[model samples]
Target: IAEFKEAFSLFDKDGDGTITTKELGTVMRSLGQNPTEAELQDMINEVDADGNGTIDFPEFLTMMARKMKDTDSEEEIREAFRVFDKDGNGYISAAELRHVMTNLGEKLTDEEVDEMIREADIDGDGQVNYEEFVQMM
Candidate 1:
């Protein structure tokens, strides 16, 4: 319960009690990994249950509650990003970020991962830090 609260705290970016695409991006980028625009769109599809194309507080709370119902906390979700942020540097580089989907139990091609890294690499620094990741998420 505490862990879920902590995780939720991180997701609610504006403190407005909702999780917007931009807010979602905050958590995603905190892991130092970035998602492409298409990837962000896909997430909007998955979590935006109201078809509003943004994840509000109620929606996000429900999402986390469902996860908590099935598990102890949202650590599974949190760790998905933590694990991908391999260096423990609190940021994910292109090479380090690629395995994140696999961590989420979604297998993607190496090429696909590389392409995503390239597309999300907005800074052109050859790395996607938390800020970049949050934008995409």
Candidate 2:
């Protein structure tokens, strides 16, 4: 339970008690594992009780509790990537992902952002879409 609480708090990047996709992705990044587009997308879809395209703190906590009992495996993690990649575009486009990080009060240097994009772009297509993002996870 304490682990769940800590995970929830960490994932809820905005500190408003919710975990947005961007926040979750950030958490994954911090964990030294990048989430694929599929995993990020699935996590949002599974935890977002309101279906508002974002997961608030309560929703995140509840989902985490349930998932804790179940334990998130590689498959589950991959699923989360899909949920965030709403467009089924096989990648997490920067344009689509810009909002959450912006709202969370963190700014990325152009260089840093480019590095992330390069790292996550699996196909060498110069893009990070759903599948590519999930592959990183």
Candidate 3:
């Protein structure tokens, strides 16, 4: 629930407690996908249960959860990667991820963090570079 709120806050650039298609489109663009205005509008329509033309918390959560269930979206995958890539070097070291998790109050053990890196480090490089991260995502 908290994570959902955090994700929603990130997408709601204006912070008005609702996410417009324009805001969602901006996020989509950041994910390397160029969604047309009409396409974004159609996406919003699919998830905007209230027909308010904007996605509120409930609508956003349901949409995100369901989307994750079937497949992944560029915007969602990009945001997850951006959060973990603290150094912005297009890579995520185990230490960098540890710091973020600690700040988020997870306090994982060093071995646990290493395991996380191992899970995504396809090249056995001991670090998660962008390519590895994308594959994991």
TM-score-sorted candidate list, best first: 3, 1, 2
Give per-model TM-scores: 0.41, 0.40, 0.45
* Native-referenced Cα lDDT, model 3: 0.75
- Deviation from native of the Cα of residue 97 in model 3, angstroms: 38
TM-score of 2: 0.40
Q: Best candidate, lDDT-wise? A: 3
Candidate number that wins on TM-score, 2 or 3: 3
Q: How many residue pairs collide in each prediction?
A: 5, 34, 0
Q: Write the per-residue lDDT of candidate 2 for residues 5-37, one digit (tens) a residue.
A: 776676676687666678778778888988787
- Which ten residues in a row are the worst by lDDT in model 1? 67-76
lDDT of 3 by residue, 1-137 (tens): 45888888999999998998888999999999897999898888888888878889988767767634234575566667787665667777656666876666657777877777666766656466765566555
Better of 1 and 3 by lDDT: 3
Worst 10 residues of 2 by lDDT: 63-72
Model 2 bad stretches (over 4 Å): 1-5, 64-137
- Per-candidate Cα lDDT values, in order, are 0.64, 0.65, 0.75
